[PDB]
Amino acid sequence: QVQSGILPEHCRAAIWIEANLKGDVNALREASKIFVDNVATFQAKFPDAKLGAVVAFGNNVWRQLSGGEGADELKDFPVYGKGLAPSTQYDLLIHILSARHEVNFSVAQAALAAFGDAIDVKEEIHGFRWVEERDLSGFVDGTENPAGEETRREVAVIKDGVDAGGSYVFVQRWEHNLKQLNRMSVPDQEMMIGRTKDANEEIDGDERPVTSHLSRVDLKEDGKGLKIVRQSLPYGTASGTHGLYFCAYCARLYNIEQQLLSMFGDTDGKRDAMLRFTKPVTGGYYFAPSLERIQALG
Amino acid sequence: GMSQVQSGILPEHCRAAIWIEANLKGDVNALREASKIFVDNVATFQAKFPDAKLGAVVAFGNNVWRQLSGGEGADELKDFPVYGKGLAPSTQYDLLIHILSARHEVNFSVAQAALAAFGDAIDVKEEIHGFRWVEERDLSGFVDGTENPAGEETRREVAVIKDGVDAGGSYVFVQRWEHNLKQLNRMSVPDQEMMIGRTKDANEEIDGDERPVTSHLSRVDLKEDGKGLKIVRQSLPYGTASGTHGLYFCAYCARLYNIEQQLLSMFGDTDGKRDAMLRFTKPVTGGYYFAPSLERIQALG
Ligand code: HEM
Ligand code: HEM
Ligand SMILES: [Mg+2]
Numbered sequence: 001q002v003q004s005g006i007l008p009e010h011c012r013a014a015i016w017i018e019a020n021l022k023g024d025v026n027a028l029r030e031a032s033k034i035f036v037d038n039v040a041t042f043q044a045k046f047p048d049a050k051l052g053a054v055v056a057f058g059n060n061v062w063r064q065l066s067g068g069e070g071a072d073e074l075k076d077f078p079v080y081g082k083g084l085a086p087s088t089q090y091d092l093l094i095h096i097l098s099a100r101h102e103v104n105f106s107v108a109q110a111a112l113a114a115f116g117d118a119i120d121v122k123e124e125i126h127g128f129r130w131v132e133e134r135d136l137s138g139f140v141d142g143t144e145n146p147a148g149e150e151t152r153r154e155v156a157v158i159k160d161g162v163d164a165g166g167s168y169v170f171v172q173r174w175e176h177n178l179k180q181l182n183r184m185s186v187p188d189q190e191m192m193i194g195r196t197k198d199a200n201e202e203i204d205g206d207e208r209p210v211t212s213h214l215s216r217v218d219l220k221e222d223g224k225g226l227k228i229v230r231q232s233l234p235y236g237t238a239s240g241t242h243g244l245y246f247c248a249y250c251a252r253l254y255n256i257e258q259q260l261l262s263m264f265g266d267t268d269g270k271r272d273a274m275l276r277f278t279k280p281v282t283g284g285y286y287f288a289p290s291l292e293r294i295q296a297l298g
Numbered sequence: 299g300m301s302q303v304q305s306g307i308l309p310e311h312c313r314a315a316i317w318i319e320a321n322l323k324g325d326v327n328a329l330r331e332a333s334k335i336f337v338d339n340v341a342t343f344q345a346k347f348p349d350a351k352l353g354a355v356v357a358f359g360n361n362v363w364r365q366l367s368g369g370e371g372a373d374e375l376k377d378f379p380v381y382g383k384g385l386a387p388s389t390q391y392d393l394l395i396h397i398l399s400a401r402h403e404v405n406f407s408v409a410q411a412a413l414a415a416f417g418d419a420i421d422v423k424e425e426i427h428g429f430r431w432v433e434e435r436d437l438s439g440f441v442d443g444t445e446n447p448a449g450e451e452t453r454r455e456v457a458v459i460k461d462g463v464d465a466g467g468s469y470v471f472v473q474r475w476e477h478n479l480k481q482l483n484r485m486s487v488p489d490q491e492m493m494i495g496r497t498k499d500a501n502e503e504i505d506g507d508e509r510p511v512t513s514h515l516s517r518v519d520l521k522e523d524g525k526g527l528k529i530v531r532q533s534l535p536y537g538t539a540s541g542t543h544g545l546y547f548c549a550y551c552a553r554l555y556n557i558e559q560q561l562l563s564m565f566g567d568t569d570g571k572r573d574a575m576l577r578f579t580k581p582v583t584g585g586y587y588f589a590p591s592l593e594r595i596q597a598l599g
């Protein structure tokens with residue numbers, strides 16, 4: 001029932017394509033069915049790749065496709081922190097992930113053939129897992145991510161009603177300034193993130209700044225954690241732009257928005273300490289319907 | 299009292315590579331310590347990631363190599379010329395950095411080390427991330443590598459200078475191609491096959507007398523009194539599905555001559571005919587470099 005790209009863990013590479021609709025929204029209906037069948041064919045051909053993919057839609061095209069039914073939290077991505085976090089809301093998101101970049105490339109080609117000239121590709125980012133699953137800053141990324149299919153479903157997959165099997169998606173490309181990061185002492189970097197660098201040990205919440213990344217995004221409501229399923233990867237060239245392509249899935253958009261409001265100063269006027277070396281340059285919210293829902297479009 | 303080849307020339311079947319092309323911004327002196335630091339970094343990464351099967355090459359353009367060598371050796375080295383009156387453009391830079399291994403993430407760390415070693419002494423012009431595609435095929439859908447020299451023994455014979463001051467060194471050629479896959483897909487599979495000189499699916503050679511003289515194999519499979527002009531290719535696909543994509547062409551040879559003769563052939567300087575691949579892809583960069591032996595990089599001071 002769930003689209004194949006949400007639940008796989010420990011992918012080695014991914015491709016994200018963000019696009020606008022140029023043609024009529026009805027063109028996305030046939031295109032989506034073609035592509036999900038393509039993914040099924042690639043999984044059969046490369047079973048070792050552990051390949052998954054997701055097709056998600058922006059608010060305006062999803063309202064049209066759904067006839068206004070369900071996805072009650074969906075909205076265009078707003079700016080956060082009054083512009084600290086920019087907004088680049090598009091109509092279509094394609095997320096391909098697997099153990100093999102060469103398979104992801106063939107699948108991305110299939111996606112483009114399926115949608116054809118109905119879409120205008122605005123962004124295409126090739127993510128790769130770095131050494132020790134670390135972000136390019138040198139800090140491990142993923143330790144507190146939900147682990148196992150059971151918990152990942154609980155966090156990311158809508159449980160019942162019209163949207164059952166669906167998920168909300170958030171994508172945001174960050175540009176790292178490693179020169180600025182490298183100017184910081186390792187203890188200062190550690191207080192910035194909220195975990196030790198080499199050992200990847202949590203720094204006690206009582207002993208780290210409230211502006212530390214963990215203090216900004218490890219949020220609880222009466223003791224219940226606001227969890228998300230992250231699929232982020234490093235990207236770029238060593239000599240050009242590089243950073244983290246941030247990608248999160250959640251059965252509720254609420255959990256993601258609460259973390260953004262926190263990071264960008266809207267909740268308590270304090271900003272994420274990571275903004276001293278990295279900045280977000282894109283931002284979008286998308287709705288990932290279930291496989292049955294996609295089949296039921298056309 | 300002998301020479302050691304740089305680690306990135308001979309490895310076969312590497313799945314990933316990084317190529318950095320840069321110009322020298324200051325005194326050529328800057329390149330001496332940077333190069334020694336960089337090859338030391340490579341040894342460090344080889345020790346930490348033994349399963350990466352990592353190799354790298356540092357190679358120099360004509361002008362800076364003449365300065366670093368004091369004009370001794372590298373007799374065939376010269377700035378890459380235009381071929382075919384401009385059909386093959388020329389983008390001769392001062393420094394080439396070729397990293398290849400089984401792991402892209404390790405290549406990325408090595409590329410960061412290369413940039414930290416040379417620092418603001420260089421101006422990076424190109425940084426290309428190559429990846430092996432399905433069945434070792436070029437993005438055109440044709441297998442790339444079948445007649446490439448196979449095994450360490452033959453690869454050394456073809457790529458590595460055997461004696462004299464340059465023993466252990468090699469000449470390198472890099473050329474980035476931009477594929478127009480829409481133009482390629484307009485062609486019937488039989489026309490594509492006549493363009494390359496091999497069948498697409500099964501990768502069978504089409505006989506020399508059955509295929510046009512403009513076929514890729516007819517252009518580059520050259521013999522001088524029965525002796526093939528062989529080269530060691532390290533080319534890989536690169537790019538995005540929706541953006542620029544193609545083949546990053548890279549070849550090593552004990553003699554620049556073998557490479558130049560294939561380029562004169564492809565670009566119409568030899569017999570006035572040109573490579574049929576120019577019907578769907580074109581070259582947008584081009585340079586020649588000298589890859590010294592590992593010890594000569596250690597005699598840089
Ligand atoms: C520059 C961009 C970012 C980088 C480099 C980054 C890095 C990290 C690192 C190093 C960790 C600790 C290891 C772990 O548990 O994964 C982490 C945790 C986390 N990040 Fe980020 N992150 C980034 C952006 C974001 C954004 C935009 C969000 C939310 C909208 C987010 C939400 C989280 C969450 C929920 C955790 C787990 C916190 C916990 O429960 O301990 N991160 N991040
Ligand atoms: C668009 C750029 C290029 C593509 C797509 C390409 C593709 C191919 C393909 C499909 C083959 C046949 C399989 C094989 O034996 O490896 C091949 C062979 C070869 N290519 Fe290219 N090639 C390109 C550029 C070049 C260039 C620039 C040179 C030389 C300067 C070159 C020299 C060779 C050689 C020597 C062979 C082996 C020929 C033989 O002995 O049968 N190629 N190439
Ligand atoms: Mg916690």
Ligand SMILES: [Mg+2]
Pocket residue numbers: 445519
């Ligand atoms: Mg032959």
